[PDB]
Design a protein around this ligand. Structure first.
Ligand code: CLA
Ligand code: CLA
Ligand code: CLA
Ligand code: CLA
Ligand code: CLA
Ligand code: CLA
Ligand code: CLA
Ligand code: CLA
Ligand SMILES: CC1=C(/C=C/C(C)=C/C=C/C(C)=C/C=C/C=C(C)/C=C/C=C(C)/C=C/C2=C(C)CCCC2(C)C)C(C)(C)CCC1
Ligand SMILES: CC1=C(/C=C/C(C)=C/C=C/C(C)=C/C=C/C=C(C)/C=C/C=C(C)/C=C/C2=C(C)CCCC2(C)C)C(C)(C)CCC1
Ligand SMILES: CC1=C(/C=C/C(C)=C/C=C/C(C)=C/C=C/C=C(C)/C=C/C=C(C)/C=C/C2=C(C)CCCC2(C)C)C(C)(C)CCC1
Lengths: 48, 55, 73, 42, 742
């Protein structure tokens, strides 16, 4: 609001959408992890 | 100290307490009565001060 | 049920396309969408805020019937 | 232990356990074999 | 005096009572002779007043049930927060709230249901939610998922604490009867402590946490660059840069020169242009004022000290022109039975819920809430239904009290006797009012339909032929529009944009709010609403008043509260109990609420919601056809039911397909209900006889002889199925339409 944080956001505009997309993809894949192949019957013990 | 608001609030609180006294004490005046009188005096003082400042 | 089946089959046969009944009659949503909702468009437009046509009386009777049905309840 | 075992044998609890086991077995069978319309083993 | 009184270990915790079902009632505990026993075991489970007669046990059971309910609610809240934290696109929606649809549920991939994972937006696939939780989280200042996880953990902990508290207060230290009968202390603590302190703490949170974070977000700062909430508390320089008043500290508050806090405590009103919601400073100011008011009002009743008021003294010393001695023995009645309190609280809660729905739709308090149409529609309909159900239940509990807890010898009240002595005039007048209102309200519509069907559009009651305008409502609207100019100099603008007069507010190319016109259609629909409400009131009042006795049956109180009839004599005495009156009034409540929600939906879609181009023209969803098509029944059937059902029936093969399936399923359930409402028990019993013979032939006869359902059970099943089917149909239709088109 002091236009310094706005300038910080403009400088770091990139990779922020990347982080958001990565978080959304992880949230979606939390249901398809088994169908993907990872988190199979082994290593479910205290995992995922 | 010495401002108009301080004098107004002090006068209101003292007058309310004095009125509440009559109409270890010679006349039964427990701490609850003093607290209620002080609170009502403070309410009245705040009201009158804010009314006067708002003109 | 019998009259619904007869009317739908014959109306599709007359309209020139028989694939509609052959395809949409195997599930009930097809019955609800391709028979009642589709064919009621001309009936419900008997009278509108703009005007009316010769079907108007039938439309009235339509609504009339509904009322009586509810009164039975 | 006797009273807890007696309670666990009441009708709703046994019914929910049986139906949960059946649903799990059916879901796992349908997962291992995705689609089935005819019996092809013969 | 006021004291803490408890009993140590009234009951012992053991599993021996779990093994034997129906231990509360001896008749149930004896054993199952037929199947009806099972149906009874669930009916009398929560009727604590029938298990025993001592008030102490009933009060303790009520307290424990309240604790368990609180634990369940906390578990539900924790689950919602955990779903928001883990499976959601909250972080993606935070940056671009206008172009992303909220979603917090993910469906598995077992059968083929993966088509339900729609493209909500932000690189996510899932079911779009309409709970409005994202707006609440944004208004609270949450910008990450770790905070949501912590909130979920805290909710789990609090649910466990509530369950342990319930167990402790039933099995270890149970309060005595005198503890519950102290209403003055309870009122003082609920007013000053539960309400004032909570609102004060929330106002403090809003002042310290919500306002700076929301200001940074509204400025345009990226959510990942905003300082953490505790940085504002730790660093006074940041707050001084944001709000200079904080640089002075708490000195102004004690100095009584409160104007210095005018930066973050304002009285402007209206909607915020950026987010289309109320100002957060106004909300904090309102919470502070409400906290002050509740804290002041919480010290009215005398408890343990000289100062205060006595409720009994206030009631007894009341003198008036129309009342007289009046309220003399009401204190004992209210402090003796639970049912009267339950009825009063139920009615008040229902009315409050309806008021909440109205105030929430009128003035949106959350950011980016007005432009999300599905959330608004869902909130309005849900709150209306909840309020209606509570209002219905109030009358049933009032009838229960009047039936089983009323005796004019030990506890006599003059007002109740006076009301009970002239019930015939009340019932007759209410019946006449209902008949007159219904005749006029529906005859207007029937006349319009008949005149339009005969090619006579100049004889109808419309804005063009015969005008019936709501002059009083228009006068009130004009007064409210002109209110802030002279009558309320403190406010910069009016409270709401609904009042005729002002400007249009739109956020992100979508209309947020604009003044709502009023015409003949609003007149007709308002009168229909009044007619339905009056009929429901008539039914409930007739049920309540004639519970003890009637001209037809002079001893109805001996039979009880839940009895089917008295017999085939006297011409027929079916459905004479108050339970039947409640079961009949449920239908009319359903009808009234359905009409209200239909009116709200059509009017909002036709006259308010829409889109705006760059030039400045506004295109509404249905193009303003409410004022000319809603004056006839055919218009309601064609332009609302037929036209707006296109989306639900065409949703197959898409992400909305589930809704369509529900649109069918509910229908089925509705029809099913008819089977329980048009038939009787004897036919089913006679059929079960032959079925039992066929079973007996093959040696598969059960010891518990099958029996047909009782009459009351059949009526309850029918009404439950009817209500469930209708409500689910409306839910599916509304959600499908508002998600596909908005
Ligand atoms: C239920 C309400 C209702 C009402 C109010 C109206 C009203 C109207 N209709 Mg419609 N109509 C209705 C339903 C209704 N209709 C229905 C259900 C149908 C059948 C489908 C029709 C079919 C219909 C037709 C076919 C026609 C109309 C037409 C008309 C008009 C004719 C009025 C008239 O000539 O007689 C009025 C007669 C009176 C004797 C008035 C009695 C009421 C008085 C004022 C009592 C007031 C009481 C007072 C306060 C008492 C206090 C006592 C105190 C002093 C001590 C009128 C505007 C006619 C038209 O052409 O109009 C444009 C027409 O041809 N109507
Ligand atoms: C009711 C009986 C049941 C049965 C027989 C199976 C059987 C099986 N499960 Mg399933 N499962 C069940 C219920 C059941 N599951 C339930 C209730 C859950 C939810 C916790 C799961 C979740 C589950 C997971 C997460 C996994 C399996 C896997 C497996 C396979 C292990 C070998 C086998 C097909 C494992 C597998 O082999 O996956 C590759 C695997 O990783 N199951
Ligand atoms: C002694 C002189 C005094 C004066 C000049 C005022 C003057 C004022 N008071 Mg009042 N007020 C007083 C005593 C006084 N008050 C006291 C003793 C109390 C405590 C009970 C209040 C409680 C009070 C409240 C709670 C409010 C006012 C309000 C107001 C203002 C609006 C006037 C109006 O017509 O509201 C109609 C006005 C400036 C209103 C205000 O300040 O709005 C800006 C307001 O909300 N007054
Ligand atoms: C308000 C009640 C509530 C409700 C209705 C749901 C509902 C749901 N949960 Mg959630 N959940 C809740 C509270 C709730 N949760 C709480 C308090 C926690 C914290 C422990 C969780 C943690 C949680 C996890 C960790 C997961 C779910 C998932 C699920 C889904 C599948 C459940 C399942 O198949 O179990 C199977 C049934 C039995 C084992 C019996 C379902 C939509 C699952 C999901 O959505 O996966 C895609 C999943 O992975 N939930
Ligand atoms: C100022 C303290 C105080 C507070 C905060 C409350 C608050 C509450 N009381 Mg009341 N009550 C008080 C004094 C207080 N009471 C006194 C002195 C009496 C005796 C006259 C009663 C008699 C009473 C009864 C008989 C009942 C309640 C109930 C309730 C709950 C209402 C449910 C609800 O509205 O959701 C609001 C939800 C929340 C805010 C949950 C937060 C949890 C709170 C903060 C727990 C801490 C409260 C407790 C008083 C303090 C702990 C003391 C202990 C550790 C020694 C709520 C937790 C009803 C209830 O639901 O029962 C469980 C109920 O049946 N109260
Ligand atoms: C605020 C809370 C509240 C409370 C504590 C009570 C308390 C009480 N009520 Mg009242 N009541 C309320 C609100 C409340 N009521 C409301 C809102 C209504 C209007 C509907 C009523 C109408 C009412 C009636 C008509 C009766 C009572 C009676 C009773 C007593 C018996 C309770 C019982 O045995 O149920 C135990 C629980 C059940 C029998 C469960 C029934 C199944 C429900 C109906 C299904 C709902 C399904 C779900 C929502 C949909 C999903 C489907 C899915 C499961 C597949 C009990 C003292 C009864 C009595 O005998 O009083 C002396 C009685 O006859 N109440
Ligand atoms: C849609 C069908 C339907 C209709 C029309 C009615 C109608 C009515 N109900 Mg019933 N009811 C129904 C279904 C229906 N119910 C269902 C499903 C239930 C659930 C069991 C109930 C349960 C029920 C209860 C519990 C109560 C009623 C009551 C009433 C009356 C309300 C008073 C009033 O508005 O009268 C005004 C008249 C009308 C709205 C009816 C239509 C009249 C139009 C305008 C035509 C008039 C035209 C003209 C005169 C005809 C002449 C032509 C002829 C000469 C050829 C009214 C007779 C209440 C009651 O009787 O108290 C007064 C009551 O307490 N009903
Ligand atoms: C008829 C009903 C009516 C109502 C409900 C209100 C309501 C209100 N008035 Mg208005 N007002 C009215 C008539 C009314 N006024 C009239 C007739 C006059 C001329 C004397 C005013 C002049 C007036 C003043 C001078 C002030 C208010 C203020 C207020 C607001 C704060 C109330 C408070 O002091 O505590 C509140 C919105 C106060 C305000 O606007 O603060 C926001 C305030 O300072 N009113
Ligand atoms: C004479 C004498 C004496 C003295 C005494 C005294 C001194 C007493 C008291 C006094 C007083 C003087 C008291 C009181 C005070 C005060 C108070 C108690 C206050 C309170 C307040 C409040 C509570 C407030 C509140 C509020 C707020 C916070 C905000 C706004 C609103 C209001 C206002 C509400 C002696 C014993 C020494 C000796 C002998 C003689
Ligand atoms: C969301 C949520 C949660 C959380 C919560 C929280 C976090 C809370 C907090 C809370 C708080 C944190 C509160 C606080 C409060 C406070 C208060 C209430 C205060 C008061 C004060 C006062 C009253 C004062 C007074 C005075 C005066 C007037 C003057 C001078 C002196 C003195 C200072 C004394 C959980 C997880 C649980 C669950 C789920 C949901
Ligand atoms: C409507 C509803 C809801 C919601 C609810 C809520 C949101 C609530 C809240 C609540 C709250 C929000 C509460 C609060 C409370 C608070 C309190 C209770 C406080 C207390 C405090 C205290 C106790 C303090 C103390 C102190 C201190 C610490 C310092 C100074 C001194 C003194 C002593 C004053 C739901 C969704 C569930 C559903 C159903 C219905």
């Amino acid at each position: 609001v002091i236009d310094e944080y706005l300038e910080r956001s403009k400088t770091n505009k990139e990779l922020n959408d990347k982080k958001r997309l990565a978080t959304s993809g992880a949230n979606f894949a939390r249901a398809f992890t088994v169908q993907f192949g990872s988190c199979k019957f082994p290593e479910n013990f205290t995992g995922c | 100290i010495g401002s108009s608001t301080n004098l107004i609030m002090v006068t209101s609180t003292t007058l309310m307490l004095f009125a509440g006294r009559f109409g270890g004490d010679p006349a039964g005046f427990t701490l609850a009565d003093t607290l209620a009188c002080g609170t009502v005096g403070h309410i009245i003082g705040v009201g009158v001060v804010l009314g006067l400042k708002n003109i | 049920w019998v009259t619904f089946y007869w009317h739908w089959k014959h109306i599709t046969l007359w309209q020139g396309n028989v694939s509609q009944f052959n395809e949409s009659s195997t599930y009930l949503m097809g019955w609800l969408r391709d028979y009642l909702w589709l064919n009621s468009s001309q009936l419900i437009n008997g009278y509108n805020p703009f005007g009316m046509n010769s079907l108007s009386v039938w439309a009235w009777m339509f609504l009339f019937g509904h009322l009586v049905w509810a009164t039975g309840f | 232990m006797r009273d807890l075992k007696t309670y666990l044998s009441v009708a709703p609890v046994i019914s929910t356990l049986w139906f949960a086991a059946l649903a799990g077995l059916l879901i796992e069978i349908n997962r291992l074999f995705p689609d089935a319309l005819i019996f092809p083993f013969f | 005096e006021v004291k803490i009184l408890v009993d140590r270990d009234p009951i012992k915790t053991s599993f021996e009572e779990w093994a034997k079902p129906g231990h509360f009632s001896r008749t149930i505990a004896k054993g199952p002779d037929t199947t009806t026993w099972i149906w009874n075991l669930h009916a009398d489970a929560h009727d604590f007043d029938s298990h025993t007669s001592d008030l102490e046990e009933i009060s303790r059971k009520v307290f424990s049930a309240h604790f368990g309910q609180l634990s369940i609610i906390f578990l539900w809240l924790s689950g919602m927060y955990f779903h928001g934290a883990r499976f959601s696109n909250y972080e993606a929606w935070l940056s671009d709230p206008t172009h992303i649809g909220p979603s917090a549920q993910v469906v598995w991939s077992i059968v083929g249901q993966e088509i339900l994972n729609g493209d909500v937006g932000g690189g996510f696939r899932g079911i779009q939610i309409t709970s409005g939780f994202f707006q609440i989280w944004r208004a609270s200042g949450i910008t990450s998922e770790l905070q949501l996880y912590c909130t979920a953990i805290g909710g789990l902990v609090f649910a466990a604490l509530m369950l342990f508290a319930g167990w402790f207060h039933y099995h270890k230290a149970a309060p005595k009867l005198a503890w519950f009968q102290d209403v003055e202390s309870m009122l003082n603590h609920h007013l000053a402590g539960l309400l004032g302190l909570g609102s004060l703490s929330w106002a403090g949170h809003q002042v310290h946490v919500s306002l700076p974070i929301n200001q940074f977000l509204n400025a345009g700062v990226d959510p990942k660059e905003i300082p953490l909430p505790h940085e504002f508390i730790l660093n006074r320089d940041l707050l001084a840069q944001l709000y200079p008043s904080f640089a002075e500290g708490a000195t102004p508050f004690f100095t009584l020169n409160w104007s210095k806090y005018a930066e973050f405590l304002t009285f402007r009103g209206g909607l915020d242009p950026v987010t289309g919601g109320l100002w957060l400073t106004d909300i904090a100011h309102h919470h502070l004022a409400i906290a002050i008011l509740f804290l002041i009002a919480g010290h009215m009743y005398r408890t343990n000290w000289g100062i205060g008021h006595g409720i009994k003294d206030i009631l007894e010393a009341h003198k008036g022109p129309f009342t007289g001695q009046g309220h003399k023995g009401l204190y004992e009645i209210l402090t003796t039975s639970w049912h009267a309190q339950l009825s009063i609280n139920l009615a008040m809660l229902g009315s409050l819920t309806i008021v909440v729905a109205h105030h929430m739709y009128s003035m949106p308090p959350y950011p980016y809430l007005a432009t999300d149409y599905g959330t608004q529609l869902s909130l309005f309909t849900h709150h209306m239904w909840i309020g209606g159900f509570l209002i219905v239940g109030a009358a049933a509990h009032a009838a229960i009290f009047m039936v089983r807890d009323y005796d004019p010898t030990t506890r006599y009240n003059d007002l109740l006797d006076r009301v009970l002595r002239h019930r015939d005039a009340i019932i007759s007048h209410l019946n006449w009012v209902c008949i007159f209102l219904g005749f006029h309200s529906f005859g207007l519509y029937i006349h319009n339909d008949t005149m339009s069907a005969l090619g006579r559009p100049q004889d109808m009651f419309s804005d063009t032929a015969i005008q019936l305008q709501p002059v009083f409502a228009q006068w009130i609207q004009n007064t409210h529009a002109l209110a802030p100019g002279t009558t309320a100099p403190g406010a910069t603008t009016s409270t709401s944009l609904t009042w005729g007069g002002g400007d249009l507010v739109a956020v992100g190319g979508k209309v947020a709010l604009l003044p709502i016109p009023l015409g003949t259609a609003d007149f007709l629909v308002h009168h229909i609403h009044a007619f339905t409400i009056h009929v429901t009131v008539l039914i409930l009042l007739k049920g309540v008043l004639f519970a003890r006795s009637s001209r037809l049956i002079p001893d109805k109180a001996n039979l009880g509260f839940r009895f089917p009839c008295d017999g085939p004599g006297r011409g027929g005495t079916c459905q004479v109990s108050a339970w039947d009156h409640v079961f009949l009034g449920l239908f009319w409540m359903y009808n009234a609420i359905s009409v209200v929600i239909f009116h709200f939906s059509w009017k909002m879609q036709s006259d308010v919601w829409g889109s705006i181009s760059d030039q400045g023209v506004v295109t509404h969803i249905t193009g303003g056809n409410f004022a000319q098509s809603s004056i006839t029944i055919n218009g309601w059937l064609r332009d609302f039911l037929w036209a707006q059902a296109s989306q639900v029936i065409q949703s197959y093969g898409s992400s909305l397909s589930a809704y369509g399936l529900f649109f069918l399923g509910a229908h089925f359930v509705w029809a099913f209900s008819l089977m329980f409402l048009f038939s009787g028990r004897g036919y089913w019993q006679e059929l079960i006889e032959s079925i039992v013979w066929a079973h007996n032939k093959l040696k598969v006869a059960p010891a518990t002889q099958p029996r047909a359902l009782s009459i009351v059970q059949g009526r309850a099943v029918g009404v439950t199925h009817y209500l469930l089917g209708g409500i689910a149909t409306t839910w599916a239709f509304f959600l499908a339409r508002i998600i596909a088109v908005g």
